[PDB]
Design a protein around this ligand. Sequence first.
Ligand SMILES: [Cl-]
Ligand SMILES: [Cl-]
Ligand SMILES: [Cl-]
Ligand SMILES: [Mg+2]
Ligand SMILES: [Mg+2]
Ligand SMILES: [Mg+2]
Ligand SMILES: [Mg+2]
Ligand SMILES: [Mg+2]
Ligand SMILES: [Mg+2]
Ligand SMILES: [Mg+2]
Ligand SMILES: [Mg+2]
Ligand SMILES: [Mg+2]
Ligand SMILES: [Mg+2]
Ligand SMILES: [Mg+2]
Ligand SMILES: [Mg+2]
Ligand SMILES: [Mg+2]
Ligand SMILES: [Mg+2]
Ligand code: NA
Ligand code: NA
Ligand code: NA
Ligand code: NA
Ligand code: NA
Ligand code: NA
Ligand code: NA
Ligand code: NA
Ligand code: NA
Ligand code: NA
Ligand code: NA
Ligand code: NA
Ligand code: NA
Ligand code: NA
Ligand code: NA
Ligand code: NA
Ligand code: NA
Ligand code: NA
Ligand code: NA
Ligand code: NA
Ligand code: NA
Lengths: 145, 246, 119, 115
Amino acid sequence: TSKKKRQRGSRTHGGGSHKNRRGAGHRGGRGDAGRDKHEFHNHEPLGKSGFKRPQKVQEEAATIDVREIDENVTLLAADDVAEFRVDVRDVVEEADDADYVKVLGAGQVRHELTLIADDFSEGAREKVEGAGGSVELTDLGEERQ
Amino acid sequence: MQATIYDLDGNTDGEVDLPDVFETPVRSDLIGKAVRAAQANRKQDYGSDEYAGLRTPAESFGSGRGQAHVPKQDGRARRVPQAVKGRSAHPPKTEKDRSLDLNDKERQLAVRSALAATADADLVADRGHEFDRDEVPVVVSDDFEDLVKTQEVVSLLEALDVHADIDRADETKIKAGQGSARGRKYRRPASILFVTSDEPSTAARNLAGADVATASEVNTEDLAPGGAPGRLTVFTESALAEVAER
Amino acid sequence: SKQPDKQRKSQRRAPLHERHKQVRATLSADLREEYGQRNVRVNAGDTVEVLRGDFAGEEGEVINVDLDKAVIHVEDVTLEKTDGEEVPRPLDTSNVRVTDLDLEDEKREARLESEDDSA
Amino acid sequence: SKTNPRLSSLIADLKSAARSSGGAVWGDVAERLEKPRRTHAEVNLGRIERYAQEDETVVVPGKVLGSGVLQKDVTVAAVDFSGTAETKIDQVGEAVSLEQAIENNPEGSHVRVIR
RNA sequence: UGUAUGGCAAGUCUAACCGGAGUAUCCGGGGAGGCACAGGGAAACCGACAUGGCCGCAGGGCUUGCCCGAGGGCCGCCGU
RNA sequence: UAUGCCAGCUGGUGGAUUGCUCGGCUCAGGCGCUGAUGAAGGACGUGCCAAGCUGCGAUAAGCUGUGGGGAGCCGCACGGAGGCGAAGAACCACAGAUUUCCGAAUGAGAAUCUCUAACAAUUGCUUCGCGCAAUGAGGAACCCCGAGAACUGAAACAUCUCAGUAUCGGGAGGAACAGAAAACGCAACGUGAUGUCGUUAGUAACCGCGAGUGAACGCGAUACAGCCCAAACCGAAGCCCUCACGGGCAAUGUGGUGUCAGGGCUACCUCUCAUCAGCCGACCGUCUUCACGAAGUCUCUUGGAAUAGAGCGUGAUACAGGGUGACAACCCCGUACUGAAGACCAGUACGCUGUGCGGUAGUGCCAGAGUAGCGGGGGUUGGAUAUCCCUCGCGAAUAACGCAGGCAUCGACUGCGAAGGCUAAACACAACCUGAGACCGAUAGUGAACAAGUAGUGUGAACGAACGCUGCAAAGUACCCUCAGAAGGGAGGCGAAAUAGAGCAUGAAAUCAGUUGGCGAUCGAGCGACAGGGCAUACAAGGUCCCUUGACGAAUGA
Ligand SMILES: [Cl-]
Ligand SMILES: [Cl-]
Ligand SMILES: [Cl-]
Ligand SMILES: [Mg+2]
Ligand SMILES: [Mg+2]
Ligand SMILES: [Mg+2]
Ligand SMILES: [Mg+2]
Ligand SMILES: [Mg+2]
Ligand SMILES: [Mg+2]
Ligand SMILES: [Mg+2]
Ligand SMILES: [Mg+2]
Ligand SMILES: [Mg+2]
Ligand SMILES: [Mg+2]
Ligand SMILES: [Mg+2]
Ligand SMILES: [Mg+2]
Ligand SMILES: [Mg+2]
Ligand SMILES: [Mg+2]
Ligand code: NA
Ligand code: NA
Ligand code: NA
Ligand code: NA
Ligand code: NA
Ligand code: NA
Ligand code: NA
Ligand code: NA
Ligand code: NA
Ligand code: NA
Ligand code: NA
Ligand code: NA
Ligand code: NA
Ligand code: NA
Ligand code: NA
Ligand code: NA
Ligand code: NA
Ligand code: NA
Ligand code: NA
Ligand code: NA
Ligand code: NA
């Protein structure tokens, strides 16, 4: 039995005094009415903040942390096994409608990896080189100077 | 496990491996959900006329004549829900979504589960079906698809000690209630489901309470009518094989 | 259609020529074999046998066939009014069986004898 | 008001074992399963790898998921495993159902609860 | 936005629509796109603990106070 | 015991309830224009007797033909009289005939009539004559083009919002509209007419930056289709009417060429299967209609009636639904299977006839002006400097030019040619046809199951109900008595039942008549709950209860 199903006979259906459930006055006005007066509580303050750059001048990077690559090296058997060598572009999903692929350095690297991507974080390099690996910057990646 | 194939005379004719799906753990809650959805999804939208009871310029006189403030036209109350001929306050509505979604995985699992309930003689007996057999489902040679006469399917079923189920379904029930006024006077028990491969059995279809289906599209409903698992079924050699990958 | 209201409606509002099928009765074993038909449209010349009412078992000649009310009058199948007059008791052809046929019409006979059509 | 008849039977079997045998884990696992689904355990392999030890059965009062790497040769017992989880675990150890765990070890000894 | 139940799970779900058919049900297909999988910053732009320490509930272990202690709690540390 | 209180019984009143459904409501598939050749609508007529409805139109519930259909018929509507039908009627389909008056209403006038040959009025052509034609008005909504509120929300209110909504003016079609880039701008070595659906996204954008408002490109789909002028260069090679003769149009340009895969011209190469014009002309599918169509009407019992129970038997590519004196696969219509016709798809696809695609080089020959663009004032939009439009003023270039790519100017880059035109298919609606339903079931559902937009109200605009059910069969009550009596009553007759007897299935409550039990003309008012006594009570569906004594015997306790 639901709450609704038990309302017949209660007269007020849980609204308290029968003088309560009337029009919008019981809500302090329609929608966000009073968000600056009687009901300012918990509303974000009024005002403008910052600016937006035009949508077609914005770049969207397709990222991936070393942890994800590394945790699936053996599983990615369909990707180069040198002295592993993986082209990040062939790993990251949504890597087509992206302006570039960037490797981030979250997690550990328990293998010697040779990564090819358009960009890397300082931390991603330190980790890949620390485990005896290398980082290869793509031709698109040649935009740092 | 193994399944005994039967020829058109009702005699054993070898046997094949009962596919793995028939080992899918019987899940009556999932089967019931699949059937509930299929049943809801074929229901038609309805609702009263949006303007029923509103086609009037009736007005309330307000205070003054010792009368309740009720809209009246030609000295007759109108429009308001408490008025005879007035609108229906919260009526059925055409806009209402009467469909029920169901994840493909969850539905496909119910299909497999209902399929498996078919391989349990005890379940099939608990569901209500009448028969004198130990092995279930009843597997038959593909030659069953070439049968044309209904009577021939009868003979085979009698030879398979499974015809008593059709005897059970050979009794219509004249339902209590007004469904009768809308074309739903009768109803009857569900009997044997015949699963073939090329085309549904034209020869078995008219049998009392029988339902015909094909392996590629047999669903939870025909496998478990009304959400109840364990329907007495009869697969075809090839049907049994096709059903395996569902 | 499958809907009861529509079924009864189409039966009660059927045009005159479509009412002939509402006055059909099963044929006797002999007649079925003879003409290759299970039933026929009862005519006012046929002899018939009552199989269901209070008059079940009685036989007689069909005296009248009303298409509108889809009913027939059979000789001697009557009711006694208060004044003593004897009036016919209307019968539904479904409770009747044709034992003899009036074949004075070339067209009706031809229709019966032909195998591609039924009378 | 559980709806799955199997989960319902498991819970009853877990209790029967905690009562009859000396098990205290099974009854503990039963109480957590009786609680709302949102509270049940959802463990990835990385967590099992970090806190499990050989010859000590890992017991998950929920479901084991496939993220991370497991190298330890451990026996993991859960209500269910994702297809990938069960595959990874069987490569280095053994994925087992709570139903089997209760049968092979009704006393619930040498077990480690992981959530 | 919560909650209870159920499926699947680092993923999950298909929408319109297409094919089939037992033809509004239903079976198959469709992942377009959505949310989740990293955050911070107005922006430029940069980009994180698959665990380092201590308490300790349940539970487990032991020679019955002593160990191990998921979750939880207190810190460290890391990205901006 | 009067007046009377409470409960019941018999009979009313009333029409609830249950059962029933010729009506609704909603969804879905199909289909879709009519009218001066006078529509739609209305008026008045029309029947043997005819008031309403339906049909029809002085040939008036109808006339003719072809096909179907069939022994009956003369609408709803079951009377009386009479008639029609084997000379094949009724009835159904298609086609034709007739089709009064008013009505766009058109010779003129008028509340449906009247007065003395009429396209009235406005137009095109024109033999300049109403000679040949057009327009008008209707339609359920859908559709396109204009005009355009307020209540309301913002807790007041002005911008904003309600909303380009309601409503108004004009108009098309079966669908409209849009449509082959002076596009897009995931900026690209990229996409490639247009609608629509899903999404992009409540994103960008707007906003007393409050409340609110709110796209697009792209993507996945549906369906797919691309062309014609103006001009250059030609210059009468042309078009319309008419059988013809003949007439009219046209140098202010008919016609050829041509249309950014730019074209023309000049010189060449090659070739056509493009395009455009025209002929032929479907399959399949879908919607509807139709033909044919299996098997019990056996026994016994109950019953007014078997479709019920028991027994025996049958068909099924048919166990959808309905009818029939009660629950029917086999009694009747149907239903499965097979087949046929019409309509739509569609004058489409395919096929064909004709035409001829294209390429190189040269050539500043051609290529749409109050335009592009700027300014003033407004409206509109998400459009913000960067939406679309109106109004007043100003105002360009000529492809070697010009526009766009979300502020302006200049350069670069990329895209694209405005100020001429056409265009199938996919999408909207629901009048009309058909199908469907966890919709309602006669105070419901439409206002409307019935005479329903009826009766009735208002000068008018407009407003607007209620009313469903005898029975298997009318067998719808003969005869007699009574009476002023075709009334009514009595007796009687029919039927299983008249307490089924006419607004007649069932027949609640409020309530009324008579009557039964209890109380009652010396007595006090929330009408009762709980205790306990009187009196009252056929059965059934409840069977307990009283006194002596005895056993057990909490708290309490002589
Ligand atoms: Cl930004
Ligand atoms: Cl985890
Ligand atoms: Cl594009
Ligand atoms: Mg994608
Ligand atoms: Mg109503
Ligand atoms: Mg009922
Ligand atoms: Mg015949
Ligand atoms: Mg006139
Ligand atoms: Mg206000
Ligand atoms: Mg304010
Ligand atoms: Mg707006
Ligand atoms: Mg755009
Ligand atoms: Mg031309
Ligand atoms: Mg505005
Ligand atoms: Mg009504
Ligand atoms: Mg007035
Ligand atoms: Mg009555
Ligand atoms: Na409340
Ligand atoms: Na209230
Ligand atoms: Na408010
Ligand atoms: Na304030
Ligand atoms: Na009205
Ligand atoms: Na009153
Ligand atoms: Na709906
Ligand atoms: Na996707
Ligand atoms: Na139509
Ligand atoms: Na009349
Ligand atoms: Na006419
Ligand atoms: Na005219
Ligand atoms: Na003229
Ligand atoms: Na207010
Ligand atoms: Na005010
Ligand atoms: Na504003
Ligand atoms: Na894209
Ligand atoms: Na009958
Ligand atoms: Na201006
Ligand atoms: Na552009
Ligand atoms: Na009524």
